[PDB]
Amino acid sequence: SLTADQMVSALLDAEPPILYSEPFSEASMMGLLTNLADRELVHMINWAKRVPGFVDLTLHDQVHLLESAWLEILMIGLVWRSMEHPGKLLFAPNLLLDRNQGKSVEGMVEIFDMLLATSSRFRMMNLQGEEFVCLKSIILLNSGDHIHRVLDKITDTLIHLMAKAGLTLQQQHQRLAQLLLILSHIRHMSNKGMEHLYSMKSPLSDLLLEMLD
Amino acid sequence: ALSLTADQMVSALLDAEPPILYSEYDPTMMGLLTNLADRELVHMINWAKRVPGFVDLTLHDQVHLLESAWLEILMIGLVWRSMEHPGKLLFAPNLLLDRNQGKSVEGMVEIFDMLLATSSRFRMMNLQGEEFVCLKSIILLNSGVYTKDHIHRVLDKITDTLIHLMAKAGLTLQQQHQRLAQLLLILSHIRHMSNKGMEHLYSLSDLLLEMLDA
Ligand SMILES: CC/C(=C(\c1ccc(O)cc1)c1ccc(OCCN(C)C)cc1)c1ccccc1
Ligand SMILES: CC/C(=C(\c1ccc(O)cc1)c1ccc(OCCN(C)C)cc1)c1ccccc1
């Protein structure tokens, strides 16, 4: 219903805050991130409810979308924070880790490097905040009819941002392609992430349902 | 390679297309799929070498891109040929499985329904052959690009090719970048399905370098 520019403003206003973290072992480092993550998830839900077209979906669909996309969203949020910190990841203002410390957790050295590669790619493209919030909304809606019309609106919005940037048509859809292809790499990183979290001993849906309702 | 046109890009990719192989005739499942995939893999190497700008890369990079994308390439091919067979996957012309047949297969418990939905998606989008071969080429160059400027230059060109096909088809410019977005978002799902497959298979850098010595 809305215009390409008020879509930007609405999403920007719905942006979650940057939370603070609470040598490392494997269990203490994953304790830090899990905590930050679970705190971060509360704010993600409130953000999702303010993404245009989300609350119009059934509760069953809202939960399902967040359930499959939550790690993707945390990761692209992490990458966005670490953009101006080459060779490092900004989990929190009080938790900036280089590649060296990432070996505290086994199997995390691979995922770590994939996040750093994404961060450099965003810097190479000089990703804007107006585009970032658009990419993040797409992730929430795509990873899981009405949804596609909303997704089609975000595409127009992204194009609108690139057209106002002074870009000709060729560089516009080229950049659009470049951006969306990164999401495939983000999905990949999430998949490898779920594995590791599954490779651990023992409520998201409970948290999702509790806060969404 | 960077100086081709959209029509020359399409023409090169279409003639680079691998043949649809058959499952081994033996009247008297993962074994059949493994056998089929390994024979398909040999044709994939020949195809990849015909993808514009792929041979401009080093031998090491060619191996890396293929080891990262091979299952995605096989899966999108599976989805493509299963398009006009609703609610059923066409692994081979003589190996056609529907859902209940597929539910009883090793670890295809998750991806079968995903592959069908992807096939449903392409069908209701009316995916053209010219678009398909473009998407498959994109997969080849993009899957391992993060795990280099020439690669992104070829990708941008395949993007230019896709847009041209949509403009010629008679789509408005708004419909053009919308369709392009839809197609590329699907690649995320295909990446997702591949990961699910790789894991199950996990329970190479070698053989590729062997095949590309040709
Ligand atoms: C990439 C860092 C990370 C997590 C993370 C990323 C971004 C962010 O802002 C916060 C954390 C991470 C770690 C643990 C985690 O667990 C939450 C789920 N619990 C309830 C099991 C989630 C994300 C991670 C995820 C999986 C495996 C290893 C590490
Ligand atoms: C989706 C069907 C499939 C295979 C397949 C897909 C498309 C195609 O055209 C042909 C086959 C599949 C099955 C086995 C397989 O193994 C080859 C590698 N071997 C040496 C381990 C590859 C793909 C599969 C992949 C992973 C797990 C379970 C099934």
Give the C-alpha separation, A120 to A122, whole Å: 5
Residue appearing with tokens 């197609």: B183
What's the start-to-end Cα distance of chain B, in Å? Answer: 21
Would you state the structure tokens that stand for residue A195, as one six-digit string? 């594995």
Task: State the CB neighbour count (10 A cutoff) for residue B160.
Answer: 17
Residue of A136, A195, A197, A206 best suited for mutating to test ligand 1, as the one with most atoms within 8 Å of CB: A197
Output helix, strand, coil percentages for chain B, rounded to the nearest 5.
65, 5, 30
Distance CA B53, CA B145 (A): 14
Q: Is the Cβ of B203 closer than 8 Å to some Cβ of chain A?
A: no
Largest CA distance in chain B: 56
Distance CA A178, CA A175 (A): 5
Q: Which residues contact B178 (CB under 8 A, 6 or more apart)?
A: A152, A155, A156
A151 touching B (Cβ < 8 Å): yes
Tell me, in angstroms, the distance from the centre of ligand 1 to residue A211's CA: 20
Under 8 Å CB-to-CB from B110, ≥6 apart: which residues?
B196
* Nearest residue to A180 (alpha-carbon basis) of A142, A128, A207: A142
Give alpha helix (H) positions in A49-145: 59-81, 108-125, 129-142
The Cα B203–Cα B135 span in angstroms is: 29
Cβ–Cβ of A177/B155 closer than 8 Å?
Answer: yes
φ, ψ for residue B89, nearest 5 deg: -105, 135
Looking at the partner chain, which of A155, A169, A191 has a beta carbon nearest the beta carbon of B178? A155
**Residue B25 three-state SS:** coil
Q: With residue A95 as reference, give the H or E element that holds it.
A: strand A95-98
B interface test, pick of A157, A171, A181, A189 with most B CB neighbours within 10 Å = A181
Cβ-based neighbours of B80, under 8 Å, separated by 6 or more: B122, B127, B132
**DSSP H or E segment with residue A185:** helix A169-198
Extract the tokens encoding A191. Answer: 């998949």
* Cβ atoms of residues A114 and A120 within 8 Å: no
Long-range contacts formed by A57-60: CB under 8 A, 24+ apart: A57/A146, A57/A147, A59/A209, A59/A212, A59/A213
C-beta of residue A43 within 8 angstroms of C-beta of residue A19:
yes
Q: Is residue B162 within 6 Å of ligand 2 at its C-beta? A: no
Q: How far apart are CA B173 and CA A2, in angstroms?
A: 20
B179 touches chain A (CB under 8 A): no
Gap between the Cα atoms of B81 and B75, Å rounded: 10
AA identity, residue B59: L
Size of chain B, expressed as the number of residues it contains: 214
Give me ligand 2 centre to Cα B56, in Å: 29
Find out whether the beta carbon of A186 lies less than 6 Å from any atom of ligand 1: no
- B23 CB within 8 Å of a chain A CB: no
Among A183, A36, A27, smallest CA distance to A96 is for A36
| Cα-to-centroid distance, B213 and ligand 1 (Å) | 42
Nearest CA to ligand 1 atom 10: A37
Task: Report DSSP letters for B76-113, one per residue.
Answer: HHHHHHTTTSTTEEEEETTEEEEHHHHHTSTT-TTHHH
Name every chain B residue with its beta carbon within 8 A of the beta carbon of A138.
185
Strands A95-98 and A88-92: antiparallel
CA distance B77 to B73: 6
For residues A108 and A114, give the distance between their C-alpha atoms in angstroms, rounded to a whole number: 10
Our CA angle for B126, B131, B135, nearest 5°, is 120
- Quote the ligand 1 centre to B125 CA distance (angstroms): 36
Sign of CA dihedral A19, A25, A28, A34: positive
Question: Domains of chain A by range and CATH?
Answer: 4-212 (1.10.565.10)
**CB A18 near ligand 1, within 6 Å:** no
Contact B186/B85 with Cβ under 8 angstroms?
A: no
Q: Report CB contact under 8 Å: B185, A114.
A: no
Residue B69 CA to residue B151 CA, distance in Å, equals: 15
State how far the Cα of B151 lies from the Cα of B139, in Å rounded to an integer: 12
Q: CA nearest A115 in B: which residue? A: B146
Query: Which residue is listed with tokens 């880790």?
Result: A97
Check residue B186 and give left, alpha or beta (phi > 0: left; psi -120 to 50: alpha). alpha
Please tell me if residue B191 touches chain A, with a CB cutoff of 8 Å: yes
| Interruption sites in chain A after residues (C→N beyond 2.5 Å) | 22, 144, 202
Chain B residues inside the 8 Å CB shell of A68: none
Pick from B156, B74, B86, B166: which is nearest to B119 by CA? B86
Residue among B12, B2, B4, B28 nearest B134 (CA): B12
Amino acid at A185: H
Between CA A201 and CA A198 the distance in angstroms is 8
Per the CB < 8 A criterion, the answer to whether B41 and B160 are in contact is: no
Helical spans, DSSP H, in A2-25: 4-13
The residues facing B88 across adjacent strands are B98
Residue with the two structure tokens 């849906």: A205
Indicate the SS3 state at residue A94: coil
Q: Show the CA angle centred on residue A104, arms to residues A96 and A76, nearest 5°.
A: 45
A46 contacts chain B (CB < 8 A): no
Choose which residue among A30, A74, A95, A99 to substitute to test ligand 1 binding: the one with the highest number of ligand atoms within 8 A of its C-beta.
A74
Phi, psi of A96 (to 5 degrees): -105, 110
| Smallest CA separation from ligand 2 atom 19, residue | B34
Rounded CA-CA distance A11/A47 in Å is 8
User: Residue B126 — left, alpha, or beta (φ > 0 → left; ψ -120 to 50 → alpha)?
Assistant: left
* N- to C-terminal Cα separation, chain A: 25
The encoded tokens of residue A55 equal 């609350």
**Where does residue B167 rank: exposed (0-12), middle (13-18), buried (19+ CB within 10 A)?**
middle
**Rounded to 5 degrees, what angle do the CA atoms B54, B59, B64 make?**
80
Give the Å distance between the CA of A36 and the centre of ligand 1. 8
